[PDB]
Every structure is written in structure tokens, then in C-alpha cells.
From a paper:
Attempts were made to crystallize a complex of CALMANTH with a peptide corresponding to residues 10–41 of VAMP8, both with the two components free in solution and with residues 10–41 of VAMP8 appended on the C terminus of CALMANTH. While these cocrystallizations did not yield the structure of a complex, they did yield a 1.8Å resolution structure (final R/Rfree 0.182/0.216) of the unliganded [name] domain with two molecules in the asymmetric unit. In both molecules the positions of the first ten helices are identical. The CALMANTH structures presented here in conjunction with the previously published structure (Ford et al., 2001) suggested that residues 265–289 of [name] are not integral to the [name] domain but are flexible and associate only weakly with the domain's core residues (19–264). Inspection of the CALMANTH surface showed that the elongated patch on which the ordered short helix 11 and preceding ten residues of [name] sat was hydrophobic in nature and of the correct dimensions to bind an α helix and was thus a good candidate for the interaction site for the hydrophobic SNARE motif of a VAMP. In order for a small R-SNARE VAMP to bind to CALMANTH, helix 11 of the [name] domain must be displaced.
Here, we show that the R-[name] VAMP8, VAMP3, and VAMP2, which cycle between the plasma membrane and endosomes, bind directly to the ubiquitously expressed, PtdIns4,5P2-binding, endocytic clathrin adaptor [name]/[name]. X-ray crystallography shows that the N-terminal halves of their SNARE motifs bind the CALMANTH domain as helices in a manner that mimics SNARE complex formation. Thus, [name]:R-SNARE interactions ensure that R-[name], required for the fusion of endocytic clathrin-coated vesicles with endosomes and also for subsequent postendosomal trafficking, are sorted into endocytic vesicles.
Author numbering: 20 to 288
């Protein structure tokens, strides 16, 4: 009940993101093994049944914050559910602000759903695993890599589909969501990029059908890069510390012709 009470405090009608003090409490909750994760999640789900965009959006932000900063047993539990958020028809018509925010609530809930689905499918969180030449994405074997990168790609699509303009970030609730989306985006991009580095190191030794898969992955990566650039430009326009924006220039983006020529040779007599 203390947990439920704090979920309520994190999700009041006040037009601002959940307060740090309540988020910090709920993080600590996830770290105590005696805490019942399903009951904490149920409280969050219940708030998403509220008619107010403010309450619903704040419950989603709280859930996202806990996925990012909480014990891994939290996202593990969300990933175990058959269904997560069901907000595809959400609409708060109480006012123009409610209309505006309803669209973003639908898109944000879809992203969190996909974040849980990604975790269910690969049994780790792309945004939090070890990086580098010795990290998870860089060391992954061929079969697993070909399976995994499309999952990253699907998660990134759902994130980018939030599709907000800088001039739409006009209240503290949506701004709070955006800051967490920004953090996930740069971390998810690093995983995507490492997956592609790995793919390119292996591509010219793969089987014909593996190369077809790899080439599809690469073409899709190139178009997502363009979208990620657009998303970072929104972050730049709104004022985010430029030192926090990653450099996309080092993504290995000039290999299309080589990949195609190699596959073409495999498809010849």
C-alpha cells in the first residue's frame, strides 16, 4: 500500500513529470526483494486507465524511468506479461492539450510495449549491456546476430515513431518523456551500430542466404540512420547539451555497394 500510495504520488494531475522523490522511492522498491513487482506494475497499469492524459502519461513515464533506472527484475516482469499497455484508443477530449498529448501517449505506450517485447525476445536490455569489442553486440555469433539486429531495428522504429517536433515539447510531462526517449535512443543506437560493425566483419564469409538477410539489415540501418539524425536534430533544437548528443559520423554507412556486389557474385552461376 505504501508502494501504491507512491505510484499515486508519481502520477498526480499536476502538469509536470513524476517528481524525483517519488521516482527514487520506486527505484528503491524494485531493489528490495520483498517487494512484489507484479503489484507495483498493477498499480502503474491501473493509473493508465485514468481518463486524464496527465495521469496516464505520468504513469507511462514512471514505468519508463523504472525500466531505465530500476532493478532488472522490473523490466523482466513486464516482458513476461502477455499484454502490457493497451492505449491505442486513448483520447482525452477535456481540452486541446488533452487532444495533443493523446497522440504522444499512444506512441509512447507502443514504444514501452516494444521495449518489453525486445527484452522478452533476447533476454537482455540492449540499452544496458556491455559495449565495446568485448561487449554483447560486438561478440555475438552470426546466427544470433542475424536474429537480433532486426529486434533492435523494430525497437528503434517504435522509439522514432514518437515523432515529436521541437515546437511540440510545450509542457513538463511530455518534456520528461522526451528526455528518457533521448537516453534510450542514444543507447539503442550504440547497440544497433555495434551490431552492424559485427555484421560487416562477418558478411563476406556468410552463406548466400545469410548475406541476403544481412543486406536487408544493412539497407534498413541506413534509412534508420537518417531518422535518428532527424531525432537528434530535434534534441539539438530544444537545447540539449551538445556534448550529450552522439556523433553519427562514425557509423559505417558506405558499404552498400560492396555488400551488393558480393551478393551478386554469389547469385551468379
Amino acid at each position: 500500500s505504501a508502494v501504491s500510495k507512491t505510484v499515486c504520488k508519481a502520477t498526480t494531475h499536476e502538469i509536470m513529470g513524476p517528481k524525483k522523490k517519488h521516482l527514487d522511492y520506486l527505484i528503491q522498491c524494485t531493489n528490495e526483494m520483498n517487494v512484489n513487482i507484479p503489484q507495483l506494475a498493477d498499480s502503474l497499469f491501473e493509473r493508465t486507465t485514468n481518463s486524464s492524459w496527465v495521469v496516464v502519461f505520468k504513469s507511462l513515464i514512471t514505468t519508463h524511468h523504472l525500466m531505465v533506472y530500476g532493478n532488472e527484475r522490473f523490466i523482466q516482469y513486464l516482458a513476461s506479461r502477455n499484454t502490457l499497455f493497451n492505449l491505442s484508443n486513448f483520447l482525452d477530449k477535456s481540452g486541446l492539450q488533452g487532444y495533443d498529448m493523446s497522440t504522444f501517449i499512444r506512441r509512447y505506450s507502443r514504444y514501452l510495449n516494444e521495449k518489453a517485447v525486445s527484452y522478452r525476445q533476447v533476454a537482455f536490455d540492449f540499452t544496458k549491456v556491455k559495449r565495446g569489442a568485448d561487449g554483447v553486440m560486438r561478440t555475438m555469433n552470426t546466427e544470433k546476430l542475424l536474429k537480433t539486429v532486426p529486434i533492435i531495428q523494430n525497437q528503434m522504429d517504435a522509439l522514432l515513431d514518437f515523432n515529436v517536433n521541437s515546437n511540440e515539447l510545450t509542457n513538463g510531462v511530455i518534456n520528461a518523456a522526451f528526455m528518457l526517449l533521448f537516453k534510450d535512443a542514444i543507447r539503442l543506437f550504440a547497440a544497433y551500430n555495434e551490431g552492424i560493425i559485427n555484421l560487416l566483419e562477418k558478411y563476406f564469409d556468410m552463406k548466400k542466404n545469410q548475406c541476403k538477410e544481412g543486406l536487408d539489415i544493412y539497407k534498413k540501418f541506413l534509412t534508420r540512420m537518417t531518422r535518428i539524425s532527424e531525432f537528434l536534430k530535434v534534441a539539438e533544437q530544444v537545447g540539449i547539451d551538445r556534448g550529450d548528443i552522439p556523433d553519427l559520423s562514425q557509423a559505417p554507412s558506405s558499404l552498400l555497394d560492396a555488400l551488393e556486389q558480393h551478393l551478386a557474385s554469389l547469385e551468379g552461376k
